Amino acid sequence: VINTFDGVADYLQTYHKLPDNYITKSEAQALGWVASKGNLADVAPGKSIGGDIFSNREGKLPGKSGRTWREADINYTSGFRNSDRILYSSDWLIYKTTDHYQTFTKIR
């Protein structure tokens, strides 16, 4: 499992895809995930939510026609989800947030 900011950022930059321990919200749901239950680790051991589209509605991340953003959970092991996320664009800009999207830090 690779689920730390640098590990995932480096992986994204190098292979242009998230590590194998990531699955989208829909995929997790199909495995029996129920957010309010906090059962992700129970129905999908070792997996973290990640790879879903990030709308960037408030324009805090670099916006540009053609560029699409996606996010992934960082530092997640089990139980309810935390406030840590890595945000990566289609042209591989990488940012992180540890305060549930209030502030972002560019790391790549």
Binding site: A35, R57, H100, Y101
Partner: protein
């Protein structure tokens, strides 16, 4: 069968709206109180089915500078993607 009520005439700011949603939807304590956080909570935290009753919407729209609309939009987009959410605009 989660239920959430927003008394629009009591909302005096966008942060007022987020604090209300945090309570009504039992959002995480780390709730970011922004649109990305709301989208995240609606699609990866909140319990369903959910009924959101937004009263005096227009009044809340005035005291939030249209921010009230952007919040409603998130709820509507979450439903559009599958979230079992019933919105009641009174």
């Amino acid at each position: 069968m989660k239920k959430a009520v927003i008394n629009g005439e009591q909302i005096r700011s966008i942060s007022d709206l987020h604090q209300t949603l945090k309570k009504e939807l039992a959002l995480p304590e780390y709730y970011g109180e922004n649109l990305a956080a709301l989208w995240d909570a609606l699609t990866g935290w909140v319990e369903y089915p959910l009924v959101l009753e937004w009263r005096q919407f227009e009044q809340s729209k005035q005291l939030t500078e249209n921010g009230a609309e952007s919040v409603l939009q998130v709820f509507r987009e979450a439903k559009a993607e599958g979230a079992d959410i019933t919105i009641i605009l009174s």
